[PDB]
Design a protein around this ligand. Structure first.
Ligand SMILES: [Fe+3]
Ligand SMILES: [Fe+3]
Length: 177
């Protein structure tokens, strides 16, 4: 059962935090992904938006990026000593970032570049808000880590808001008049 892969592999920018038995390790994985989104993924989407002639959508992605760093920093405050390193999958994503950056004028000139960037943002925001962070919050609570559970609950709310922002932006982008 073969499906075509997305235009320029843009879907592979989405990175999911990894599930563990221990809430520290879920936190470490979250920090890693949220900082990748803050540092790498959303800034690249922002530049695709600007180069596409969509500076308002670019500003949205810059605003979201800052918030991803807030999520990371909330967790790092709770886990002051944790040493976060990029996994093989994050490193591969950062390589894809760099290859798209090198081709950024071609990606932006095609209407699909920004469309797929917004659809990929929607994909992560949906998975993180509806699946990954609820599961981390639930496990934190089960383990008696109330402060971390409450942090994950706040990140769930925030990622939900990002999903809504991204859907309204996508609805805009596509509607010409
Ligand atoms: Fe995120
Ligand atoms: Fe988000």
């Amino acid at each position: 059962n073969y499906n075509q892969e997305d235009f320029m592999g843009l879907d592979r920018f989405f990175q999911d935090a990894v599930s563990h038995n221990n809430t520290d390790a879920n936190a470490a994985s979250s920090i890693e992904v949220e900082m990748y989104e803050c540092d790498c993924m959303y800034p690249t989407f922002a530049e695709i938006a600007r180069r596409s002639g969509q500076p308002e959508i670019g500003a949205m992605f810059d605003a979201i990026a800052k918030e991803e760093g807030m999520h990371a920093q909330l967790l790092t405050k709770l886990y002051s000593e944790l040493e976060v390193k990029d996994s093989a999958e994050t490193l591969e994503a950062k390589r894809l970032v760099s290859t798209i950056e090198s081709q950024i004028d071609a990606v932006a000139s095609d209407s699909r570049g920004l469309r797929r960037a917004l659809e990929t943002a929607l994909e992560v925001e949906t998975i993180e808000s509806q699946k990954t962070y609820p599961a981390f919050a639930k496990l934190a609570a089960e383990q008696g880590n109330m402060e971390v559970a409450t942090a994950f609950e706040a990140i769930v709310k925030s990622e939900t808001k990002h999903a809504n922002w991204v859907k309204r932006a996508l609805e805009n982008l596509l509607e010409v008049a």
